[PDB]
């Protein structure tokens, strides 16, 4: 069986991504190097912490490959700062408050939860090439062994 590849909206290229301390970046700024964008549901949860620390454990290998990592959730910069102060992630956390980046990658899903319908981030990750192409995607991500799988995919597509 086969499926259709992801098509990002043209506006995604320079969407300003809110980081900490009134600073920001863009996907455009990452051209020339591999990029891993991982979306997680909520700051300070066991799953978000484990996924982030797993990427921390592999950062030296990602760095060797010249790749950069960006974690993303809809939480505020303040929330990210707290999460950051407690776990110490060696990479930036994007505060996608207006869900612009989440919608671009189509990770916002509606699910029957807590006795009602809830819109939120479906844990997903994307690997982008130095040329800005989405090379591989992971949706409905299971945290265990995920960062390992992303690094393995990177190595398979690169050198
Ligand atoms: O993937 S888990 O099942 O660990 C998970 C993680 C964060 C969540 C956040 C919400 S939120 O809608 O309250 O932010 C709801 C369900 C969640 C499930």
From Swiss-Prot:
Catalysed reactions, as listed in the record: a hydroperoxide + [thioredoxin]-dithiol = an alcohol + [thioredoxin]-disulfide + H2O
Single Gene Ontology MF annotation: thioredoxin peroxidase activity
Enzyme Commission number(s): 1.11.1.24
Misc note: The active site is a conserved redox-active cysteine residue, the peroxidatic cysteine (C(P)), which makes the nucleophilic attack on the peroxide substrate. The peroxide oxidizes the C(P)-SH to cysteine sulfenic acid (C(P)-SOH), which then reacts with another cysteine residue, the resolving cysteine (C(R)), to form a disulfide bridge. The disulfide is subsequently reduced by an appropriate electron donor to complete the catalytic cycle. In this atypical 2-Cys peroxiredoxin, C(R) is present in the same subunit to form an intramolecular disulfide.
SUPFAM superfamilies membership: Thioredoxin-like
Disulphide bridges, residue numbers: 48-84
Function: Thiol-specific peroxidase that catalyzes the reduction of hydrogen peroxide and organic hydroperoxides to water and alcohols, respectively. Plays a role in cell protection against oxidative stress by detoxifying peroxides and as sensor of hydrogen peroxide-mediated signaling events.
InterPro entries with a match to the protein in the record: AhpC/TSA, Peroxiredoxin_BCP/PrxQ, Thioredoxin-like_sf, Thioredoxin_domain
Gene name for this UniProt entry: bcp
UniProt keywords, alphabetically: Antioxidant, Disulfide bond, Oxidoreductase, Peroxidase, Redox-active center
Active-site residues from the entry: 48
Protein name per the record: Peroxiredoxin Bcp
Annotated GO biological process: cell redox homeostasis; cellular response to oxidative stress
Species annotation: Xanthomonas campestris pv. campestris (strain ATCC 33913 / DSM 3586 / NCPPB 528 / LMG 568 / P 25)
Family stated for the protein in its record: Belongs to the peroxiredoxin family. BCP/PrxQ subfamily.
Enzyme class at the top of the EC tree: oxidoreductase
CDD domains: PRX_BCP
Example of a GO cellular component annotation carried by this entry: cytoplasm
Superkingdom of origin organism: Bacteria
Pfam families: AhpC-TSA
Summary of subunit composition and partner proteins: Monomer.
């Amino acid at each position: 069986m086969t499926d259709a590849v992801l098509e990002l909206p043209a506006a995604t290229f320079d969407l300003p991504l809110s980081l900490s301390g009134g600073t920001q970046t863009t996907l455009r700024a990452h051209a020339g190097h591999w990029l891993v964008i991982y979306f997680y549901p909520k700051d300070s949860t066991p799953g978000a912490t484990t996924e982030g620390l797993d990427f921390n454990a592999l950062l030296p290998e990602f760095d060797k490959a010249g790749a950069k990592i960006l974690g993303v959730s809809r939480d505020s910069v303040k929330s990210h700062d707290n999460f950051c102060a407690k776990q110490g992630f060696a990479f930036p956390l994007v505060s996608d408050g207006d869900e612009a980046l989440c919608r671009a990658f189509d990770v916002i899903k509606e699910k029957n939860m807590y006795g009602k319908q809830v819109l939120g981030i479906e844990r997903s990750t994307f690997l982008l090439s130095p040329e800005g192409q989405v090379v591989q995607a992971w949706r409905k991500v299971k945290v265990a062994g995920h960062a390992d799988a992303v690094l393995a995919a990177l190595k398979a597509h690169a050198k």
